Amino acid sequence: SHGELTPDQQTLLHFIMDSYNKQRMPENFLILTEMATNHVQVLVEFTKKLPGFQTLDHEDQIALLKGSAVEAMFLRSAEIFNKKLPSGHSDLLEERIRNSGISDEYITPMFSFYKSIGELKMTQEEYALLTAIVILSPDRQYIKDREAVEKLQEPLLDVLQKLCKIHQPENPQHFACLLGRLTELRTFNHHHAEMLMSWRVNDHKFTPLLCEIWDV
Numbered sequence: 001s002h003g004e005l006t007p008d009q010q011t012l013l014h015f016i017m018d019s020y021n022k023q024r025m026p027e028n029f030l031i032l033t034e035m036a037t038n039h040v041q042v043l044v045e046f047t048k049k050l051p052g053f054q055t056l057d058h059e060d061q062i063a064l065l066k067g068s069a070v071e072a073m074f075l076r077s078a079e080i081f082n083k084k085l086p087s088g089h090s091d092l093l094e095e096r097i098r099n100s101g102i103s104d105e106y107i108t109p110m111f112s113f114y115k116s117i118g119e120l121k122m123t124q125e126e127y128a129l130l131t132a133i134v135i136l137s138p139d140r141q142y143i144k145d146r147e148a149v150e151k152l153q154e155p156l157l158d159v160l161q162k163l164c165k166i167h168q169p170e171n172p173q174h175f176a177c178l179l180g181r182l183t184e185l186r187t188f189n190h191h192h193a194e195m196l197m198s199w200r201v202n203d204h205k206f207t208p209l210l211c212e213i214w215d216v
């Protein structure tokens with residue numbers, strides 16, 4: 001129903017939001033595991049409903065899913081911290097994770113990013129499209145047909161650029177700022193691999209789903 005979008009774009013956005021609108025939340029290692037599990041289940045569920053995703057080569061589908069897991073998780077946590085949780089519950093969660101064994105080096109960039117993207121005041125529609133763009137990244141490792149992914153991603157980038165003008169007409173660089181934040185988001189691929197290492201070598205048992213998605 002945004003009249004600035006073409007009919008094709010309207011349906012694209014509608015299906016994306018229908019799927020995204022279904023997203024959820026509510027010893028230490030088990031708490032962390034439960035949280036990651038929730039993130040991976042919602043990632044798989046949203047990914048399978050992306051427009052065009054069922055037309056991709058099956059190996060490439062899995063490569064996009066695994067290639068996007070850490071970034072989707074940070075983007076989603078970012079949306080939850082800015083739009084769903086009282087700041088009061090956030091300083092509580094920060095104190096909790098810093099005495100979980102996870103270190104600074106992981107936690108500090110984490111909260112810096114939540115603030116950083118919080119400055120953009122993105123709408124739910126913007127987070128949903130940015131998430132779909134992140135999952136449909138033609139540059140992931142191991143992708144055999146990048147052009148087929150590019151063809152799926154370009155129309156979403158076009159819808160997002162329009163959404164940025166619909167929701168923040170007074171800020172003409174807003175779309176560029178969103179893309180900019182994507183750079184900051186990719187650093188978590190390194191922060192997460194670093195962070196996981198200590199848990200891997202003291203071996204805690206990672207569930208079959210986390211071994212497969214995080215490759216541990």
Ligand SMILES: COC(=O)CCc1cccc(N(Cc2ccc(-c3ccc(N(C)C)cc3)cc2)C(=O)C2CCCCC2)c1
Nearest residue numbers: 025028031032033035036077080093094096097098100199
């Ligand atoms: C004991 O658990 C905590 O102290 C977790 C808390 C916390 C603070 C800030 C942000 C979040 N996250 C992010 C998140 C990042 C990484 C991992 C994670 C790290 C390591 C493992 N292993 C080593 C199996 C598993 C999962 C889980 C969650 C958010 O997700 C949400 C948590 C609750 C709702 C709001 C944000 C959680």
